[PDB]
Design a protein around this nucleic acid. Structure first.
Ligand SMILES: [Zn+2]
Lengths: 241, 207, 219, 329, 331
DNA sequence: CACCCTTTCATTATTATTATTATTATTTTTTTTTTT
């Protein structure tokens, strides 16, 4: 639960590929795991092909991939974990809006790991930190790290309900982009400019960009109730093995 | 454009609040300011008017006030005659005041050649006064055609050129000291936009 | 001396993904001051703790600087900045036929590789940034006077500091604890905003090798 | 080391902005739905805090070119004008990662974290070009900083806080330029116009009936293969405007300032913000203030002869082996 | 080559501005509502930073032809007068997608984002025409870069640095020109005039009754569209001096020779629009090649290396490069 | 061997917009120079 690579041996039980070298000398961190490779641990030399564009988010310059990372750099891991929720018991998919609602409102209690793809697939499994505390959450989205506070998210939900009590048509207070790519992602709507209090407007700017991206998922017209993911740990294991 | 062309220059904030429209009220107010400059002068003074009418009005307001000290340039008084006159009065120890125009704006050496090696004691021109921004001072055929092509950009451009040539009378060599510059046109201190170039030459002096 | 720094900046800066400690900023200013003094070829880990900032020690080691993360008072609405990295395919074709370039492959790939056009959107804030710290004044003054910009990706010109003011304040008036510190840190300093995470507490806050369990606030 | 380059865009500026921006037949931008609205990519714009009109600052639009585009333009002008000719004369050639680090600054040479020794870090930052644009796998710090091209405008008046109130623009900065592609098989019409076609008359008529059927299919769809007719808009910055450009070098070598100065000398044949076909980004340099003293002439940079001499010795000393050692190892 | 060409329009210039503009009968553009207004189709305007007064720098409207427009015009002159003549004196022929690529840039919409080979990009940018107009489905960067047509005007002083202070206009630069569109059978006067119409007087009088019924319908709506449409359109005045800056980033000599041979065919071409009203005719009065004046009244009388290069490249012209340019990777 | 190429995964699900606003109209009177 301390490193992202702990989702290889504590969940999704896999062994080394056994074409991997054993580490010798003064210990260094893995390039991808951020985990120190210690003497007697299995590593591969960094055999990343030239298409690998996540060199920017590498932890260290060791050019040494830990074996857990080698499993994380498998493609079934890359597309399988593209839209899933990681917990100490198993993986849940965060693809459903209600799955997202369940993640940012009443999250699971375990030290989980939240990974979401801005494209078809990228390498985001080994570059996001694990979330020891439910209150502060590290979300990987595309190539950008994110922080969601669930308490802030529920509070923003309560206001989006509260200004929308008693009117037939659901109007969002503030636009958010699901891809978080628009210039207006974060900008308050004119209807929200009139239905938004001075403290509320300054609160809604005060949220971190992860919560902006989160509240894009659950801020639409049909408000999603928090519903637990369907299991993907067995699917990922089947796709890996 | 060296620093020593503007370093001895003394810039005063005092001016004539009346704009020059060839009116009597302007000429009395500008004559009062010119009398103030002449009183604070410890040497020769050249005020530079644009038009003959402005010069005639100033002369009628300053002749009895300033006595023998006044020099006027007119139809019967050339710039060279008043040049030798100005040098003669500075030779005699009294402080002359000059109501100069025409060639007094451009192309006159107001530095002492009786003081070649010592510019620190050069005192032929202690006070230079600009009574009006020199607009419309060239009326040649080629320049009127060029004005007709370009518009007011040519006129404001040539007015800035005549303004810098009138301002070049103060410093003619390095080493001079305590040189006084005055501008009394009220468009200098108004918020009008078209007189904006005459700010930035004015911005090269301080205090 | 128990003082607050506020900084007002001209261009908008990139909105920091994770809380940025003031101590991290002044450690970089000390590193660049050393690069001015002791030349380019110097190890930055020797000077990035040489700070005019006091040190809070956790009960089991785990010392952090007495600084806090910068809190944002937004003057402008938040926006998102797109930037792309695209290699010039046309220039590369000319250099390939000319022989200056030595690439065997004849086809580019915008999905990945050398010629990967790539588009990324980073959050942007223009604000006033406030940080609490415990520390002497004049070293912080000289450092922040050397400081030109704030925010990430400065090579494209973001977040230039228009000015800064640094002034003393009361002992109870400044929670400097709004900062990533070891969880073993004393309770007085951990508030409800602090939470457990894989956070850096010191020095390079991007060094994932040095990352460990920590109680940190959210930006 | 601060360089302030003030330029005047001879042709308009169009730095394309993300988003599906919408515009009516008139100038109304992003109309409410239910009206006839048209696609539109505007120029890059940001909300800046300007102290205009009163003592408070407000978020006003300010349309510029991003500093990433400008850093890339400076990098490419050095590459084509200085690095290309000097390197080409020697006879040296660049590999995959050498060209990727020189031209893109990307880590595709080897896409893993290169551990760089301090001696290598000191001499490549002491190298001119690698000092200016470090990056790629070695992850090197750039000595050169590029600020974005800010126009001399009321909205940027606090960014240009002192010495820029003269020749300073006010009011609207952008204008919608409309572009229509149309079908040229609509613009035929003589028998001499059609003999150049494979299939000729029948091929052109088959194109016509395909366009007709596509039009009827679209009309029935409203109540995926498109044609060639395309009427669209793009918002551009107006030409003739003076832009500022801040180039800050963090403790440079002398050859680095000489390289930036040679780029500013030879930059006149290169363009800003794209829009190549419309020939947008054409510009002329009005001034270059090196640490505040004006050094730009109409015929290049007059002065800074130590910079020119240092970069002359450097580009005589320029070699691709330094690029390869910056790339691979 | 930084080609600068000054062309004197000898008839008005009408590159129409999209929008919904109106004008009263007097000639006030876009009047306040309630007054009788007629639709006005203005010429193409760009706002330009210009020197009004001295340092009061302002966005004024300057009336231009778009760079996209005159770029298309440059393409069509070379395509009409150099490329396709030299393509049909031999047996080469073009597919309809490759004609659409040679004229509109692309054979269709919906471009393939799959890029193109480096040997391909190099061979198309070494082509005389394709390197100039780099369209295709895989989007090339063409090396021809065409300016908007600027009138040599006091509002374009910042655009045109020096050398154009003489022969430079000022003030208002346009004229509103009105059109009537008179219904033709109202002009009908006798049985001799009406014999070509089927039925003669009965059909003419029937359309007259239709027009009066539509007039009652219009009077009912105020308090199916006829052939009386009296409107206005704003043109740029004739005889103005304009500047045109062609730009070529490291051209092959054949490519600038293609520009110069196109310029040779620039005469008897129409700039902007108004083809019924002869708008857009012009005469080139100057061509400069790197600032060197290369235009006589007979023709170019210069740029000879580019001329023989484009000569050798147009007997070497064939349809294979055009077809492999227009070929779509998905299709 | 390094490189260069071809094809697998996910299923999300509404979609606010910046409502900012857009094409002009101001001076003014010298008197030089040193050529045929
Ligand atoms: Zn690893």
């Amino acid at each position: 639960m301390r490193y992202p690579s702990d989702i290889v041996d504590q969940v999704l039980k896999a062994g080394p590929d056994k074409g991997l070298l054993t580490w010798e000398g003064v210990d260094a961190a893995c390039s991808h795991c951020s985990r120190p490779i210690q003497n007697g641990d299995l590593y591969s030399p960094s055999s990343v092909g030239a298409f690998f564009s996540d060199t920017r988010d590498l932890a260290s310059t060791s050019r040494s991939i830990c074996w857990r990372c080698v499993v994380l750099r498998k493609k079934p891991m890359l597309y399988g974990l593209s839209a899933a929720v990681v917990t100490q018991d198993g993986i849940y998919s965060i693809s459903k809006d209600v799955n997202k609602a369940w993640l940012f409102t009443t999250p699971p209690p375990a030290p989980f790991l939240v990974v979401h793809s801005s494209s078809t697939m990228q390498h985001l499994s080994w570059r996001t930190p694990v979330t020891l505390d439910n209150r502060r959450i590290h979300v990987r989205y595309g190539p950008n790290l994110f922080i969601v506070r669930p308490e802030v998210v529920r509070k923003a939900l309560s206001i989006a309900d509260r200004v929308n009590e008693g009117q037939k048509k659901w109007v969002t207070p503030v636009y958010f982009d699901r891809k978080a790519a628009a210039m207006g992602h974060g900008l308050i709507t004119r209807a929200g400019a009139e239905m938004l209090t001075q403290e509320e407007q300054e609160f809604f700017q005060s949220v971190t960009p992860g919560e902006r991206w989160a509240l894009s998922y659950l801020m639409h017209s049909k408000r999603p109730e928090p519903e637990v993911g369907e299991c993907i740990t067995e699917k990922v294991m089947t796709s890996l093995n | 454009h060296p620093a020593w062309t503007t370093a001895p220059v003394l810039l005063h904030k005092e001016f004539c609040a009346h704009e020059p429209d060839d009116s009597p009220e302007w000429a009395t107010e500008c004559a009062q300011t010119i009398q103030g400059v002449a009183s604070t002068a410890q040497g020769g003074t050249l005020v530079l008017c644009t038009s003959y009418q402005n010069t005639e009005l100033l002369a009628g307001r300053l002749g009895a006030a300033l006595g023998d000290r006044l020099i006027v340039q007119s139809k019967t008084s050339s710039a060279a005659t008043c040049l030798a006159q100005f040098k003669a009065k500075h030779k005699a120890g009294i402080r002359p005041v000059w109501l100069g125009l025409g060639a007094a704006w451009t192309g006159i050496d107001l530095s002492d050649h009786s003081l070649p090696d010592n510019p620190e004691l050069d005192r032929l021109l202690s006070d230079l006064v600009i009574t009006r921004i020199p607009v419309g001072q060239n009326r040649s055929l080629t320049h009127e055609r060029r004005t007709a092509i370009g518009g007011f950009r040519i006129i404001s451009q040539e007015a800035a050129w005549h303004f810098r040539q009138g301002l070049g009378r103060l410093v003619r060599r390095p080493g001079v000291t305590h040189k006084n510059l005055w501008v009394l046109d009220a468009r200098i201190y108004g918020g009008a936009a078209w007189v904006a170039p005459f700010r930035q030459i004015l911005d090269r002096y301080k205090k | 001396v128990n003082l607050k720094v506020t900084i007002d900046l001209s261009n908008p800066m990139m909105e920091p993904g994770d809380l940025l400690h003031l101590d991290a900023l002044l450690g970089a200013l000390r590193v660049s001051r050393a690069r001015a003094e002791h030349g380019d070829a110097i190890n930055p880990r020797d000077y990035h703790y040489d700070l005019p900032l006091e040190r809070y020690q956790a009960p089991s080691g785990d010392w952090v600087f007495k600084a806090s993360a910068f809190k944002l008072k937004r003057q402008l609405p938040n926006q998102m900045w797109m930037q792309t990295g695209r290699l010039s395919i046309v220039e590369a074709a000319r250099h390939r036929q000319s022989g200056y370039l030595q690439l065997r492959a004849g086809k580019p790939n915008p999905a990945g590789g050398p010629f990967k056009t790539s588009i990324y959107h980073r959050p942007i804030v223009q604000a006033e940034l406030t940080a609490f710290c415990v520390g002497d004044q004049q070293g912080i003054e000289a450092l922040l006077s050397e400081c030109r910009q704030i925010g990430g990706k400065r090579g494209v010109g973001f977040g230039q500091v228009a000015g800064f003011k640094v002034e003393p304040v009361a002992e109870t008036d400044c929670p400097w604890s709004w900062r990533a510190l070891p969880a073993d840190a004393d309770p007085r300093l951990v508030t409800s905003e602090h939470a457990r995470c894989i956070a850096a507490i010191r020095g390079p806050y991007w060094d994932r090798t040095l990352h460990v369990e920590a109680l940190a606030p959210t930006p | 080391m601060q360089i302030e380059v003030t330029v005047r865009n001879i042709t308009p500026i169009f730095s394309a902005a993300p988003g599906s921006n919408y515009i009516t037949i008139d100038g109304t931008i992003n109309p409410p739905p239910g009206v006839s609205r048209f696609p539109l990519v505007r120029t890059r714009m940001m909300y800046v805090a300007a102290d205009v009109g009163d003592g408070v600052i407000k978020s006003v639009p300010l349309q510029i070119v991003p500093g990433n585009t400008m850093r890339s333009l400076l990098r490419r002008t050095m590459l084509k004008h200085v690095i290309e000719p000097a390197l080409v004369e020697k006879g040296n050639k660049l590999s995959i990662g050498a060209y990727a680090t020189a031209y893109s600054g990307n880590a595709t040479g080897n896409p893993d974290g290169v551990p760089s020794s301090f001696d290598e870090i000191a001499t490549m930052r002491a190298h001119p070009f690698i000092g200016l644009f470090g990056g790629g796998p070695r992850m090197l710090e750039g000595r050169l900083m590029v600020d974005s091209l800010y126009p001399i405008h009321t909205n940027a008046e606090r960014i240009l806080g002192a010495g820029y109130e003269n020749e300073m623009m006010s009011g609207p900065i952008t204008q919608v330029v409309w572009a229509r592609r149309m079908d040229p098989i609509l613009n035929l019409g003589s028998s001499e116009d059609v003999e150049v076609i494979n299939g000729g008359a029948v091929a052109a008529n088959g194109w016509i009936q395909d366009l007709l059927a596509n039009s009827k299919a679209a009309a029935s769809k409203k109540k995926n293969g498109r044609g060639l007719k395309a009427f669209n808009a793009h918002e551009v910055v107006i030409p003739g405007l003076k832009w500022v450009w801040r180039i800050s070098l963090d403790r440079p070598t002398d050859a680095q300032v000489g390289l930036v100065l040679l780029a500013l000398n030879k930059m006149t044949n290169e363009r800003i913000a794209g829009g190549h076909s419309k020939d947008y980004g054409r510009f002329v340099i009005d001034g270059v203030s090196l640490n505040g003293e004006q050094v730009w002439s109409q015929s290049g940079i007059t002065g800074g002869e130590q910079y020119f001499d240092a970069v002359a010795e450097a580009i005589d000393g320029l070699s691709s082996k330094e690029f390869e050692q910056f790339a691979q190892s």
